[PDB]
C-alpha cells in the first residue's frame, strides 16, 4: 500500500492491480485469466485426414 485514502492500483488503462476495496486493502498483481485463439494446420483432404 502507498497511502490510506487511495489504494486502487492501476497504471495504464486496464491492468488495475487491485481487486475492488478490501478492508485490508493493499495491492499485489493481476492474473484473472489470459488465453488466446487457435488455428488448424492441414495438408489437404485428398492428401490426408
Amino acid at each position: 500500500k502507498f497511502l490510506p485514502f487511495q489504494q486502487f492500483g492501476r497504471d495504464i488503462a486496464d491492468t488495475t492491480d487491485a481487486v475492488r476495496d478490501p478492508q485490508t486493502l493493499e495491492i499485489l498483481d493481476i492474473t484473472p485469466c489470459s488465453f488466446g485463439g487457435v488455428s488448424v494446420i492441414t495438408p489437404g483432404t485428398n492428401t490426408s485426414n
Binding site: 495504464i12 488503462a13 486496464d14 491492468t15
Partner: peptide, 28 residues
C-alpha cells in the same frame, strides 16, 4: 556493411545502429 562475427546478433554495425535507434504502447 557485412555482419561482424564478434557480435552474437550476427548483424553489421550499420544494421545494429538502425536496430537500436528504432524503438500502453505494447501492454494492452
Amino acid at each position: 556493411i557485412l555482419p561482424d562475427p564478434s557480435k552474437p546478433s550476427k548483424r553489421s554495425p550499420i544494421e545494429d545502429l538502425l536496430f537500436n535507434k528504432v524503438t500502453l504502447i505494447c501492454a494492452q
